[PDB]
Design a protein around this ligand. Sequence first.
Ligand SMILES: O=C1c2ccccc2C(=O)N1CCCN(c1ccc(=O)n(-c2ccccc2Cl)n1)c1ccc(F)cc1Cl
Length: 349
Amino acid sequence: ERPTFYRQELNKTIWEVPERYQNLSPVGSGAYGSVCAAFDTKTGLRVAVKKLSRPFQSIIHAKRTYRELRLLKHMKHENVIGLLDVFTPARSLEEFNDVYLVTHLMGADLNNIVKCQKLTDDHVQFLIYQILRGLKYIHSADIIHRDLKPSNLAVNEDSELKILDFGLARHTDDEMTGYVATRWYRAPEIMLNWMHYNQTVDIWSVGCIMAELLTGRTLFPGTDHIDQLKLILRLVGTPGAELLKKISSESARNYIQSLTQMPKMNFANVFIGANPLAVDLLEKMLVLDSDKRITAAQALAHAYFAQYHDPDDEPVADPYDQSFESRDLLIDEWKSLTYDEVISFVPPP
Ligand SMILES: O=C1c2ccccc2C(=O)N1CCCN(c1ccc(=O)n(-c2ccccc2Cl)n1)c1ccc(F)cc1Cl
């Protein structure tokens, strides 16, 4: 039941897709890869389509292609980007050399829309509520986003949100250097590799994002790793004895101890005028010791989200098997695994 495909060239790139997809038009000019907006005549849905070209040029790329396909296929939740379709014009494994990923078209990211703007409390409630609802789902699958930031939150005109880029963290050191948003939303334990981190790193990011929506200002806009750590500790206090022991990195621990101790600041005096429940939630997300941060499941039940919370409509996911991460396979083996995942795709109900 292979559909009929047609070809067209968009900004020097050939797109060969099923007839059901019409009105293809480029988006982003290429800064984020080959992406097009389109209309899915079969479902009546506006869609975003990403074409991965030569996804098997090396072991590293082949494995990355497999990883992204596996992650996207696993996610089926309103607040997480997932797959409406995935296809290849190839008729066999031999000619298989391109992968197209189809998702809901959102059309904008939170950073591009609200940067530098203070949002109303009810708007922050709605936006953070959806982020946490999607995070609860992602975390229940044993997946860590690792790089949550405004630019990774796809939003439409009605402020509906879907989380992008979960589980794909390949930021170069240079990209994390200096006065950059690539590092401002990172939990300290991961920014400076203090210990083996876990899903709690994402809650810190949500805290950074929430504070910024409430104030219109980046919470920890460090000029570099060290400056940023100082900005963080000035707000949440230097590490106590209990947390110091959890820092398994001897070098990191020794550096932290060289700093003058500081107490946690009063958040009501930092976030002046904010809803007391938002201040309380921020204090519960922005805890230095990750073991003590509120989890996404617990935060959804927090009073701040009383107007949105519904325990019968905050679904969890099936467990995600990432055992493949520990394997070293050849390009062709990764490619065959990817091909299997493409041909076994089953459209959403
Ligand atoms: O990650 C970004 C981003 C962030 C901010 C601004 C623009 C962009 C962008 O083009 N990308 C790359 C595309 C990221 N993807 C999606 C999906 C839906 C979606 O509305 N957008 C999207 C986000 C912001 C501006 C335009 C678009 Cl079209 N992006 C995406 C994810 C997974 C998949 F399988 C296919 C696709 Cl097409």
